[PDB]
Amino acid sequence: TGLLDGKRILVSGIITDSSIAFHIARVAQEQGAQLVLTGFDRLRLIQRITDRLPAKAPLLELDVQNEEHLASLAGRVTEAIGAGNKLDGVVHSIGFMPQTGMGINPFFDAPYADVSKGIHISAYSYASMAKALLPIMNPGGSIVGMDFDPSRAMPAFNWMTVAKSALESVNRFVAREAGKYGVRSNLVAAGPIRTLAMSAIVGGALGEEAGAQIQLLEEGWDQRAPIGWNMKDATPVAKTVCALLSDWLPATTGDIIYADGGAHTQLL
Amino acid sequence: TGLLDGKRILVSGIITDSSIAFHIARVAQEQGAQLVLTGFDRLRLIQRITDRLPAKAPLLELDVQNEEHLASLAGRVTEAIGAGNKLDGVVHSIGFMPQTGMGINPFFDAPYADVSKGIHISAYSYASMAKALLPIMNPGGSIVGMDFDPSRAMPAFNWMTVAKSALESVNRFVAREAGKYGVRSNLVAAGPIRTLAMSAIVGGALGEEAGAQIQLLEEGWDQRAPIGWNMKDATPVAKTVCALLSDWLPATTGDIIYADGGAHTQLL
Amino acid sequence: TGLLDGKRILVSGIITDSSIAFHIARVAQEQGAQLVLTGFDRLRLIQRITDRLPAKAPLLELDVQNEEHLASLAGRVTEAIGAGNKLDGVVHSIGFMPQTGMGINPFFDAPYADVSKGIHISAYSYASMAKALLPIMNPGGSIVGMDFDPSRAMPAFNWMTVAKSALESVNRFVAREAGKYGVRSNLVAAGPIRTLAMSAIVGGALGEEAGAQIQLLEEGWDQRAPIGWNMKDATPVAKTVCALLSDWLPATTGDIIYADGGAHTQLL
């Protein structure tokens, strides 16, 4: 019946009802998965948001920069899903770069402390979460992280693009470790999605020049994509994550699946 | 229930019960698809082989070098599935290179007539089949072709690797045309599979040097793959094709999905 | 003194004074190389054109589809440069695709006979020329071919882009063969250059839609290139070919050097 029937899956990264991870969680539940959610900092808000998912799911606190949160995560997950049960899936949908590393602020003016925080949250934490959770993952399991194609430089996204380049490299090493558990590790490289932060940026939150550049980027994406690209609809991305969480891509690991309308395959 | 329930899917490329397309067809039927099969030249043999699939499927003759076969294909498919019905999926699992273009024969000694025949069958025909079948494909449909990663030169596969480089390029253009129909086009890049031809080559059919090189290639593949690689098991490849035929990769087109154990993501 | 002082270098592909190979030949002579030229079909025209190069150079006929021309080429070169002398460099600057394979004519409507001729001239002939000339190349020599980045599909260039994908694959195999002679093989992927044919296409020779698409492609190239791109100036491309012909890239082979203003490294 459901693509993910019986699977136990941890989903990080919900902060609003427009988070990509909110849609990942909704579709996974539609497909029969039993979820455990993790949230950062504003847990009352996240609980109120995820009350709207089609099924109940326990919410655990996880700041990926907090060593104590990471050290206790597996035991808290096991308590939530029951002793003797393990996870079949993990979704990393976590990203952050201080404002100095994006938008109008010149690329050269981002101090390393800011870049380092952004790489910690956006790239290193993919390894951190796999380290914490692989000991409680079943063979045949799947770890999926969210990516944005960084193979070519862009306007505005600056150091966040560098962080995604690092994340793609981290994923290839996580795949080596995860394989020892019979677990796959892959990224979904999505086209642009109008999350609250992205809408705020297009609205000029990081400077008019950066907002204009990002609006132009979105327009070219739908133009290039042979099947089009709808930045207001995260469901195609959520479905692709669920495909990697399923048993139907069993020989793919260390890899990147592009849920971008095909835009990255076309020049114009 | 089934991943492909209700979908009508054409599968080319069955010649033995170890053909990758035989396993594609079996898994697709297991997942509820209604198939139409195409075969080249030895139709009594192919019918006897496909009698072992879990469900009946009409068999149509298709030599992709035959313009008349291509011009009549859509009408013959429609007759097989019924007027007013269209295809949801197409599988291209067709490849050939004359012996002069592979194995012990020096790369420089393949005459162009032989290379051209191999590129016709292995690359151009992906465009030929899409041209013939897109007019009878439903929106939301999917065209999938079989690939072998040609981004780096290898021993022995010589001009067939060139043909796959061409195929990957053709796929990106087919995606442009298919998008106008609401149809996706993608390739699955598989690791090595012990088909009858591959077993015969490892056995020395194309020279001892080529057999030795191919055996070494297979060994390195399983070694590199973080989840391993079983050349005797086509099912992981067949499942990946079915994933692309399903509705669960709806924003991927013009693209390549690697069903190779992750080997291409690792150096050693 | 000269970058190429004392080197003997064969340059194919001159047909007008705006051919990329005309500028390759001029710069190579400026840098002290002694050239042998090859031309296709219109030899009186090519001789009149190359009379304007800074130094004399013998002109040999070479139709790369003519097996007899290829079989006699080495002996004719040796006669031109003197017994006991060998070539240090070879430049392949040859490309062709029938009109049916480019521009307004739909991608699906190019007959295979036309595509096959274009792949013969544009891709297979890189292997043909290396086969003919490696027996008369010195260790430390260099073979260079002209490329146009085909990693993503474009409007209009259709089957010529497929042919470049094939050429890049051929180059990686030629490098394997050339290495046995101590010879390197590489491609230069150039940005768009306003040759006579390209000007004619922008002028609508292959349909208004194709001319418009190509003009848009040129505009985006200069916009993306961090150092800009001047389609009216082939000299930066010619210099890059000369760099690969020199001794200053001695550990690069099977590879692609991008002389494109950096455009392919940037999204926008």
Added chain:
Amino acid sequence: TGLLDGKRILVSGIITDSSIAFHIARVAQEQGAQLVLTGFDRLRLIQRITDRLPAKAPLLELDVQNEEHLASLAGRVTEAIGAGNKLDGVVHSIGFMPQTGMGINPFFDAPYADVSKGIHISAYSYASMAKALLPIMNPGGSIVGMDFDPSRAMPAFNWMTVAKSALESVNRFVAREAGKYGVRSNLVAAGPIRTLAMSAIVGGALGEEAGAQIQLLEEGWDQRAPIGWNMKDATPVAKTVCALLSDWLPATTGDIIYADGGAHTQLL
């Protein structure tokens, strides 16, 4: 005469007479460049080492993690080369990862503080140096950094490979900034070179497993490279850096030139 005659070029990264930057500096001086050198921490040692270069060159202290060193660098360079003179070239040959991020120590056990230091020195500092030096670079200038192909995960190099993935991304953004000055930015991806640190690692300094894996990596490199690979000879790498510092790759930026014997173009 000399490839770099009259050019003023800053070279970082000398620590021993087997440093890649020592050979870069030697070849650049052989080709007529006037150098300024930067060294980290052990300046008496570095001065004694660089006394063996064919020409005198002033040595400036530069710890790329020291904001004060970076803020004063341009003024100290100008003092060394004379008011009214600017640099034509910059060589970044700087890399470091704490031991916890390489070798026998499990990938997951590297603490982020260590990874962050390694990314600071190995990747961010490429942007730091360009920021400091672009204001005193001439149009037509060239910035070159040293890379090791990180597109596929490897044994042992672990987080240093992640750092190179980040560096490649940084280079594409530096190219955008440098283009405004008429300056190119590129990396040379070298094959393995037996520096003192690399010899020490093969000797087991980071665990026997890591030493064995690295020795196997070197062996496969020479085997794959169509022209071979000599890990005891940095001169082919130094020459390639000088090519990018010259005027002979004037349309290449944001890019990576592979000085690796062609190994990355071949599977086996």
